[PDB]
Amino acid sequence: GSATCAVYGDGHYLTFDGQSYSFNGDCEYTLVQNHCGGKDSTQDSFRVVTENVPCGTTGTTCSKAIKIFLGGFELKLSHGKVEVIGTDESQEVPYTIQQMGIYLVVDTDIGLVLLWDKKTSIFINLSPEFKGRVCGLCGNFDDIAVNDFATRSRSVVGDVLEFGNSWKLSPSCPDALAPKDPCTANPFRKSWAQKQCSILHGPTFAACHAHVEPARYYEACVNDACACDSGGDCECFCTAVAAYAQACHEVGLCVSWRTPSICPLFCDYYNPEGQCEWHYQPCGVPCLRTCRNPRGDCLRDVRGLEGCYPKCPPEAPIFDEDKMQCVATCP
Amino acid sequence: HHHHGSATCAVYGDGHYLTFDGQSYSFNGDCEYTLVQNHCGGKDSTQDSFRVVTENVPCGTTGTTCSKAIKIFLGGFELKLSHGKVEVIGTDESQEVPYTIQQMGIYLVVDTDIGLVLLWDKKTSIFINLSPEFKGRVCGLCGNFDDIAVNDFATRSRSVVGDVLEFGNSWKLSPSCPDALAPKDPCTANPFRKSWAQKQCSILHGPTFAACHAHVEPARYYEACVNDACACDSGGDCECFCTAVAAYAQACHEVGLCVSWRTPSICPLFCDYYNPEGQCEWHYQPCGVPCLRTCRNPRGDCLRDVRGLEGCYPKCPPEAPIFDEDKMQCVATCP
Amino acid sequence: HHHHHGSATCAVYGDGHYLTFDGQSYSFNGDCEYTLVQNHCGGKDSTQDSFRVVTENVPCGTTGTTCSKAIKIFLGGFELKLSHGKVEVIGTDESQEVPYTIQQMGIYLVVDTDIGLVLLWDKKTSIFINLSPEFKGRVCGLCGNFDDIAVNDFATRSRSVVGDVLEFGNSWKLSPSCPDALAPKDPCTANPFRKSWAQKQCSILHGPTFAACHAHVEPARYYEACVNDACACDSGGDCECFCTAVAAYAQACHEVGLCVSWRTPSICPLFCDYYNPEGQCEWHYQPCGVPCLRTCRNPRGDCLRDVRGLEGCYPKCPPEAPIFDEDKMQCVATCP
Amino acid sequence: GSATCAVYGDGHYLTFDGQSYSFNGDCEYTLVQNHCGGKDSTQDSFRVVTENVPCGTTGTTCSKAIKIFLGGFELKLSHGKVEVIGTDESQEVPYTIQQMGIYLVVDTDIGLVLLWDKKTSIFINLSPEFKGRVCGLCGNFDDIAVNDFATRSRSVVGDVLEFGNSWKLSPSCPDALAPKDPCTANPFRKSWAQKQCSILHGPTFAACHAHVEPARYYEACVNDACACDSGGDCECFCTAVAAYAQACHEVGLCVSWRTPSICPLFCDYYNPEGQCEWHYQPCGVPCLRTCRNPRGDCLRDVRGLEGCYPKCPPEAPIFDEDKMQCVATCP
Ligand SMILES: [Ca+2]
Ligand SMILES: [Ca+2]
Ligand SMILES: [Ca+2]
Ligand SMILES: [Ca+2]
């Protein structure tokens, strides 16, 4: 059905076709190109652009900002803040911004939806219609995995570094280079990294191990924890584990991996004084009664979510999107 | 506000000590060091042994150690605190238990019957709250408890020594263990972490602790936060920062002022995890619940002695209000 | 706000008995005003805020003795006058926060000041003064100079020691126009017929119930005080005279730490059940005096208990609603 | 209906037929004698005599101990206790002693009821069966007020002193003399006496002022307060006020006046710790089931028994006449 491309952590990319690799560079790159070859007709113009900056001793880079071109609308994402720098006289809002759980989801009627975590991880979900007519970091969107290493031109080069360098926004940004092992660079952190990422091999994800392999995710976790010594290693570990959790939720499984000791949430903070209406749902609550989407409306899309959700009481059951409360009716 | 007649020794982070009389200093050394002793030798004025010892261990590549295991020997009993669990190594023939273990909030409250109550968070920090009864009878790393700060460096030799390192090594336990040295500058050792350290520790200068800024200074605590963040380069810097800020938070709450600082962005708490399915009995309390009806406290009795028991507590409904001291639930009654 | 645990006690009760902070005791009387406690000691200003207390003493019988009728407090421009169990506020500027916190406690109208001084009033010629140690060696007046020595008292307003109690009182009197005082005849000699009744009433001091305090506080001086105050007081209400005389010794015993339950339905009774809500029994006599309560002014967790020994009727809140609603006379579960 | 005499304070009297006066003298006086002529009259003889010992330096006598004789049964009463001396194993003990309220009450099957407050005050209740048959200081019960002051040998004189001296018992006791003014003797106490006894004119007795005049009771209060100079004027003041309250409650009016300011009680003292079963009942408790008092015995004994009362909780509702507790059932 709908495809999925994942970008997270220290240059970890998952193509639409399932291919994975690593690539880091202090430059802007296009995760997906709509008008591959400038086919402006019979299609809606859109783009997804990521901004990377080095975030460690080894020089590896991580995503910091997300800029999306969308039919004459340009949106800027940075530290959980959505910004608009592009609009059109049509006055219609093609995109909808929602805060479902920890994720900040933007959906457009054209069939595209981005599951952008507020910190550093971005997920792309595309309708099957755009199969075979998009290209870029996320792949060419067909059933064949090998051909996805195609440059900005139609030429196919097997070098991961060459493929990454080809899709740079401007020649001004420097060419990327193959990174050394952060674990080798900082062997002292290796033991702590292994102990932290051992949860991926723990009993918590044993159920998901059947449908999704943890090996690549395990080495990604340990490498990221070895790196990002400049601060917030807990953030790196949390992002890696959250990426694995979202991958598990892709197939439909649901695991409550979060504990008060590791990567905990603060659902009680959003809770109103005295009144309790918030809980953490590992699977996510689909089709909750909001102002825009009351119980009359519903959508089984964006499968796979987690975080704090408002347990609306039966009285005043419709959630207030802009007031963060449960109300009987909405404006 | 201004207070007199109570004291509490504070040890947290990497060698950050706060004596009973208010002295603050840094220290290091992979050894065991006595914390407090009342007998001050063979002289026992109808008291108990009352000896608290702490074992250190280097954490990080900068040669800076942090507290990992804490043993409290009292009346022959030996209780070891490590890996977040209370362990008892020796039980005396006196069937009367001289200590009570309660998980009040995040802290692992250890309260004794002789007016001594401990405060362990299972993570490289400890607060030794002491009754004013033992005033002037305290020999150890937490000062003389004579309400004088300068003489707290009398060392085990009982001669005042200017060097904090000499003081600590005099109070050291194992002769075979190596002597301490001057700690290296952490931020100088790891320059790249300085910006992140400042960004994290800026919370102390932020508006959240505006009320505490008037009463308790944040400068030393901010310096400790920056130092620990710079030094914690062997993983788990988030825990270092959380403990550093929590020390100042508890110090502010000790004077009586209530301050809420935890946010989902910084040092979050996940007490909804303990919440039974569809109950929401637990909630967040900055000052903590002063007292509640537990299995071990079925009466509405309230000690109300220690201050600022941070964490999340269960707001039991009026039906079945007495809490379960063992099964973590709001039950109708206890055995 | 926060007050230190250390304290010193000065007491005055009945027909003009006094108890200095140092421990010195002396009998005195006079129809004048007297600065019991002086902060600046004659205009010598310091960093600490200036405060001063004074009492109005009127004749209280036909033997010439005087008992403290009205208590006047001066601190930071604020003037508090106490009379007939009420509190008169005269000096008050709203540009500054009120420094005192009046709060009824047992049979005492506890008025607390943020400086470090708390005052206890019995509404019947009885005053208890508690002072923070930070004022040691700085205060002066009838309550003493607050040092370890006791015989070095009788420090006149002229910063001189005269030794004679009468001359000390005359020099530390306030009103210049008011006449000189003098030790009068023995009231028991004046009214010998009441001597037997006085002995019968005050025998409780030598009674078995005070044997525990006998080893800590010598009742002999208190016995003489009780006998003398039972004598005179001929203008009516001798029961109040005897009750406050006994209560002085009881409070002195409570200051040591010992607890005595001396009140019986026959001698100095208290009508605790009067304050009890209809069909409910929460008020109960507490000889010790409960150190702290759960109120709106004092929240559930707050238990500031610097002062001890406040005997009186006290509401024992039910466990379901342990928080007491002061000024509402009920126990609840929350405060606004 | 049933007659009622009363004696209280310094020789203040109120006959059954409403005559009110004052008297004094340190001598035994026959309050009530069942035989006017002293003959058998085909009826057992009951005789009640008190001793008005001097009370106060001013020279006014007041009752201290009260002696009661009937059929060889003597119950010396003093110091708040019953001291039975005279008794007869024949027939059956014709008296039961109870302590309802503050009052100590002894009742006889013949219809004569005595109320004692243990402090210089006595109240008599007599059935109408004895009307026109009794003689004593309390006056002959014949519904006539003028025919009172009946001296011995059935003679009437206008001198209260001579009437009392005729009814005197001790041959050698001194003759009574006209009382002086205690307030004139002690003008200093007069201000306090007036201020304290002004409670009678206060609003708390407004509901009873119309039914019974307070002027005589106020005069008695002020005179006794002036007279009381040996220590304990509170006692005589409380006795006067309680006498007026009992006179009011005899009519049926229900008045509550006890407050910690004036004449306080100590009901809590009887209450055991954690057992607040005792309470103050100014109006009296008509129905009780204390031990000998049968369970569910909601009948009437006397009206106006003001005092602390042990309100029994519903469980174990039988109060203990000797233990001061609520038991299930006394033997
Ligand atoms: Ca492909
Ligand atoms: Ca010291
Ligand atoms: Ca002195
Ligand atoms: Ca008649």
Short mmCIF file of N, CA and C in Angstrom, two decimals, chain D residues 128-223:
data_model
loop_
_atom_site.label_atom_id
_atom_site.label_comp_id
_atom_site.label_asym_id
_atom_site.label_seq_id
_atom_site.Cartn_x
_atom_site.Cartn_y
_atom_site.Cartn_z
N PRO D 128 -49.44 16.54 95.06
CA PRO D 128 -50.61 17.21 95.65
C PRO D 128 -51.32 16.39 96.72
N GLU D 129 -50.96 15.12 96.90
CA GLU D 129 -51.62 14.29 97.90
C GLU D 129 -51.35 14.80 99.31
N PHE D 130 -50.24 15.50 99.52
CA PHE D 130 -49.87 16.00 100.84
C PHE D 130 -50.39 17.40 101.12
N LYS D 131 -51.17 17.98 100.21
CA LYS D 131 -51.66 19.34 100.40
C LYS D 131 -52.53 19.44 101.65
N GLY D 132 -52.31 20.50 102.42
CA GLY D 132 -53.04 20.68 103.67
C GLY D 132 -52.64 19.72 104.77
N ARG D 133 -51.46 19.12 104.67
CA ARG D 133 -51.01 18.14 105.65
C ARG D 133 -49.59 18.37 106.16
N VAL D 134 -48.84 19.30 105.58
CA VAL D 134 -47.42 19.44 105.87
C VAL D 134 -47.18 20.73 106.64
N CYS D 135 -46.10 20.73 107.42
CA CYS D 135 -45.68 21.89 108.19
C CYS D 135 -44.16 21.93 108.23
N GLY D 136 -43.60 23.12 108.04
CA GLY D 136 -42.16 23.26 108.03
C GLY D 136 -41.76 24.66 107.62
N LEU D 137 -40.44 24.87 107.60
CA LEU D 137 -39.90 26.15 107.17
C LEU D 137 -40.25 26.44 105.72
N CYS D 138 -40.32 25.40 104.89
CA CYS D 138 -40.76 25.55 103.51
C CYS D 138 -42.23 25.93 103.41
N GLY D 139 -42.93 26.09 104.53
CA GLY D 139 -44.31 26.53 104.52
C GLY D 139 -45.29 25.37 104.41
N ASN D 140 -46.49 25.60 104.93
CA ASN D 140 -47.54 24.61 104.83
C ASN D 140 -48.15 24.63 103.43
N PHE D 141 -48.29 23.45 102.83
CA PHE D 141 -48.79 23.33 101.46
C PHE D 141 -50.31 23.30 101.51
N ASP D 142 -50.92 24.49 101.39
CA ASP D 142 -52.37 24.59 101.36
C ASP D 142 -52.85 25.56 100.28
N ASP D 143 -52.03 25.84 99.28
CA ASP D 143 -52.33 26.75 98.17
C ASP D 143 -52.59 28.18 98.64
N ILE D 144 -52.17 28.53 99.85
CA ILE D 144 -52.38 29.85 100.42
C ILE D 144 -51.01 30.44 100.76
N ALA D 145 -50.77 31.67 100.31
CA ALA D 145 -49.49 32.33 100.56
C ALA D 145 -49.48 33.11 101.86
N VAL D 146 -50.59 33.77 102.19
CA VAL D 146 -50.63 34.60 103.40
C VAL D 146 -50.54 33.75 104.66
N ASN D 147 -51.14 32.55 104.65
CA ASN D 147 -51.12 31.73 105.86
C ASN D 147 -49.75 31.14 106.16
N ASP D 148 -48.70 31.52 105.44
CA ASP D 148 -47.36 31.02 105.71
C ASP D 148 -46.78 31.74 106.93
N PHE D 149 -45.48 31.57 107.16
CA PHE D 149 -44.84 32.01 108.40
C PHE D 149 -45.54 31.42 109.61
N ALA D 150 -45.95 30.16 109.48
CA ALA D 150 -46.69 29.47 110.53
C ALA D 150 -45.71 28.91 111.55
N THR D 151 -45.65 29.54 112.72
CA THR D 151 -44.77 29.10 113.79
C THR D 151 -45.22 27.73 114.30
N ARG D 152 -44.44 27.18 115.23
CA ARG D 152 -44.78 25.89 115.81
C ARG D 152 -46.09 25.98 116.59
N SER D 153 -46.68 24.81 116.85
CA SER D 153 -47.98 24.69 117.50
C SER D 153 -49.09 25.36 116.69
N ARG D 154 -48.88 25.45 115.37
CA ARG D 154 -49.89 25.95 114.43
C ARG D 154 -50.33 27.37 114.78
N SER D 155 -49.36 28.28 114.77
CA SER D 155 -49.60 29.70 114.99
C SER D 155 -48.87 30.50 113.92
N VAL D 156 -49.48 31.62 113.52
CA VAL D 156 -48.96 32.45 112.44
C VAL D 156 -48.61 33.82 113.00
N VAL D 157 -47.41 34.31 112.65
CA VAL D 157 -46.95 35.62 113.07
C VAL D 157 -46.36 36.33 111.86
N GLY D 158 -46.27 37.65 111.96
CA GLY D 158 -45.72 38.48 110.91
C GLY D 158 -44.22 38.67 110.95
N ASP D 159 -43.53 38.03 111.88
CA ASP D 159 -42.08 38.18 112.02
C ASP D 159 -41.40 36.96 111.41
N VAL D 160 -40.61 37.19 110.36
CA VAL D 160 -39.87 36.11 109.73
C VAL D 160 -38.84 35.53 110.70
N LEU D 161 -38.16 36.40 111.45
CA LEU D 161 -37.17 35.94 112.41
C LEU D 161 -37.81 35.06 113.48
N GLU D 162 -38.95 35.50 114.02
CA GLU D 162 -39.63 34.71 115.04
C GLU D 162 -40.16 33.41 114.47
N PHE D 163 -40.64 33.44 113.22
CA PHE D 163 -41.12 32.23 112.57
C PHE D 163 -39.99 31.21 112.43
N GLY D 164 -38.83 31.66 111.95
CA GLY D 164 -37.69 30.76 111.83
C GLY D 164 -37.21 30.24 113.17
N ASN D 165 -37.18 31.12 114.18
CA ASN D 165 -36.74 30.69 115.50
C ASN D 165 -37.72 29.71 116.13
N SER D 166 -39.01 29.87 115.87
CA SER D 166 -39.98 28.88 116.32
C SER D 166 -39.75 27.54 115.63
N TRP D 167 -39.47 27.57 114.32
CA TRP D 167 -39.22 26.32 113.61
C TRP D 167 -37.82 25.77 113.85
N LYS D 168 -36.97 26.47 114.59
CA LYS D 168 -35.64 25.97 114.90
C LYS D 168 -35.72 24.65 115.67
N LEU D 169 -34.63 23.89 115.61
CA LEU D 169 -34.56 22.57 116.23
C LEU D 169 -33.70 22.54 117.48
N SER D 170 -32.47 23.04 117.40
CA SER D 170 -31.55 22.95 118.53
C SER D 170 -32.02 23.85 119.67
N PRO D 171 -32.23 23.32 120.87
CA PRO D 171 -32.65 24.18 121.99
C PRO D 171 -31.62 25.24 122.36
N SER D 172 -30.33 24.95 122.22
CA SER D 172 -29.28 25.83 122.69
C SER D 172 -28.67 26.69 121.60
N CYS D 173 -29.12 26.57 120.36
CA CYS D 173 -28.55 27.37 119.29
C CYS D 173 -28.98 28.83 119.44
N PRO D 174 -28.13 29.77 119.01
CA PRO D 174 -28.45 31.19 119.21
C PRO D 174 -29.68 31.63 118.43
N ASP D 175 -30.37 32.63 118.98
CA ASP D 175 -31.54 33.20 118.34
C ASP D 175 -31.15 33.96 117.07
N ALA D 176 -32.03 33.90 116.07
CA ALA D 176 -31.79 34.61 114.82
C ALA D 176 -31.92 36.11 115.02
N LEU D 177 -31.23 36.86 114.16
CA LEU D 177 -31.20 38.31 114.24
C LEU D 177 -31.36 38.89 112.84
N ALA D 178 -31.86 40.12 112.77
CA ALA D 178 -32.16 40.76 111.50
C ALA D 178 -30.89 40.92 110.67
N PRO D 179 -30.86 40.42 109.43
CA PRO D 179 -29.64 40.52 108.63
C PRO D 179 -29.33 41.96 108.24
N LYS D 180 -28.04 42.23 108.08
CA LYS D 180 -27.56 43.53 107.64
C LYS D 180 -27.41 43.51 106.11
N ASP D 181 -27.01 44.64 105.52
CA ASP D 181 -26.86 44.71 104.08
C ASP D 181 -25.44 44.33 103.70
N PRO D 182 -25.22 43.19 103.05
CA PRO D 182 -23.85 42.81 102.67
C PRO D 182 -23.20 43.80 101.72
N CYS D 183 -23.97 44.38 100.80
CA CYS D 183 -23.39 45.35 99.87
C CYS D 183 -22.99 46.63 100.58
N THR D 184 -23.79 47.06 101.57
CA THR D 184 -23.39 48.18 102.40
C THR D 184 -22.13 47.85 103.19
N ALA D 185 -22.04 46.62 103.71
CA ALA D 185 -20.85 46.22 104.45
C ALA D 185 -19.61 46.23 103.56
N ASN D 186 -19.74 45.76 102.32
CA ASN D 186 -18.62 45.65 101.38
C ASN D 186 -18.99 46.37 100.09
N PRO D 187 -18.97 47.71 100.09
CA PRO D 187 -19.29 48.44 98.86
C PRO D 187 -18.30 48.19 97.73
N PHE D 188 -17.06 47.81 98.05
CA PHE D 188 -16.07 47.55 97.01
C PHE D 188 -16.48 46.38 96.13
N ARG D 189 -17.04 45.33 96.74
CA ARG D 189 -17.50 44.18 95.97
C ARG D 189 -18.79 44.47 95.22
N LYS D 190 -19.46 45.58 95.52
CA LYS D 190 -20.79 45.82 94.96
C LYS D 190 -20.74 46.01 93.45
N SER D 191 -19.71 46.70 92.95
CA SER D 191 -19.60 46.93 91.51
C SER D 191 -19.46 45.61 90.76
N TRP D 192 -18.55 44.75 91.23
CA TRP D 192 -18.37 43.44 90.61
C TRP D 192 -19.64 42.61 90.72
N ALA D 193 -20.30 42.66 91.88
CA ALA D 193 -21.52 41.90 92.07
C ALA D 193 -22.59 42.33 91.07
N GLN D 194 -22.79 43.64 90.92
CA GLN D 194 -23.79 44.14 89.99
C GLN D 194 -23.44 43.78 88.56
N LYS D 195 -22.17 43.95 88.18
CA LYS D 195 -21.76 43.63 86.81
C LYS D 195 -21.96 42.15 86.51
N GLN D 196 -21.66 41.28 87.48
CA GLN D 196 -21.79 39.85 87.26
C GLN D 196 -23.25 39.42 87.23
N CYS D 197 -24.06 39.90 88.17
CA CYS D 197 -25.46 39.50 88.24
C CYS D 197 -26.34 40.21 87.22
N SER D 198 -25.81 41.20 86.50
CA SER D 198 -26.58 41.82 85.43
C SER D 198 -26.93 40.85 84.31
N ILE D 199 -26.39 39.63 84.34
CA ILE D 199 -26.74 38.63 83.34
C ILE D 199 -28.23 38.31 83.40
N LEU D 200 -28.83 38.40 84.59
CA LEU D 200 -30.24 38.08 84.74
C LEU D 200 -31.11 39.00 83.89
N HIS D 201 -30.81 40.29 83.89
CA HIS D 201 -31.52 41.23 83.02
C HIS D 201 -31.11 41.10 81.56
N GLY D 202 -30.11 40.28 81.26
CA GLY D 202 -29.60 40.14 79.92
C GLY D 202 -30.59 39.47 78.98
N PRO D 203 -30.31 39.54 77.68
CA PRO D 203 -31.25 38.97 76.69
C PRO D 203 -31.43 37.47 76.81
N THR D 204 -30.47 36.74 77.38
CA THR D 204 -30.61 35.29 77.46
C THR D 204 -31.78 34.87 78.34
N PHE D 205 -32.17 35.72 79.29
CA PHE D 205 -33.32 35.47 80.14
C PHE D 205 -34.55 36.28 79.72
N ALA D 206 -34.50 36.91 78.54
CA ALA D 206 -35.66 37.67 78.07
C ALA D 206 -36.86 36.76 77.84
N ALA D 207 -36.62 35.57 77.29
CA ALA D 207 -37.71 34.63 77.04
C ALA D 207 -38.41 34.20 78.32
N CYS D 208 -37.74 34.31 79.46
CA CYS D 208 -38.32 33.91 80.74
C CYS D 208 -38.71 35.09 81.62
N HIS D 209 -38.31 36.31 81.26
CA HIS D 209 -38.62 37.47 82.10
C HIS D 209 -40.12 37.66 82.27
N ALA D 210 -40.88 37.51 81.18
CA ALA D 210 -42.32 37.73 81.25
C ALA D 210 -43.01 36.70 82.15
N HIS D 211 -42.60 35.43 82.05
CA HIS D 211 -43.27 34.38 82.81
C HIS D 211 -42.99 34.50 84.30
N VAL D 212 -41.74 34.71 84.68
CA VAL D 212 -41.35 34.84 86.08
C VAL D 212 -40.47 36.08 86.23
N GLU D 213 -40.78 36.89 87.23
CA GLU D 213 -40.02 38.11 87.44
C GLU D 213 -38.59 37.77 87.86
N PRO D 214 -37.59 38.51 87.35
CA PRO D 214 -36.20 38.28 87.77
C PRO D 214 -35.73 39.17 88.91
N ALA D 215 -36.53 40.15 89.32
CA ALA D 215 -36.06 41.16 90.27
C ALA D 215 -35.62 40.53 91.58
N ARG D 216 -36.44 39.63 92.13
CA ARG D 216 -36.09 38.99 93.39
C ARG D 216 -34.83 38.15 93.25
N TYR D 217 -34.72 37.40 92.15
CA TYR D 217 -33.53 36.59 91.93
C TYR D 217 -32.30 37.46 91.74
N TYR D 218 -32.45 38.59 91.06
CA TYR D 218 -31.32 39.52 90.90
C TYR D 218 -30.88 40.08 92.24
N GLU D 219 -31.84 40.46 93.09
CA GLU D 219 -31.49 40.95 94.42
C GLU D 219 -30.78 39.88 95.22
N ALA D 220 -31.26 38.64 95.15
CA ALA D 220 -30.59 37.54 95.84
C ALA D 220 -29.17 37.35 95.32
N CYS D 221 -29.00 37.42 94.00
CA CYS D 221 -27.67 37.25 93.41
C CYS D 221 -26.71 38.32 93.91
N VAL D 222 -27.14 39.59 93.87
CA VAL D 222 -26.24 40.66 94.26
C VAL D 222 -25.95 40.60 95.76
N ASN D 223 -26.96 40.28 96.57
CA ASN D 223 -26.75 40.17 98.01
C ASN D 223 -25.77 39.05 98.34
#
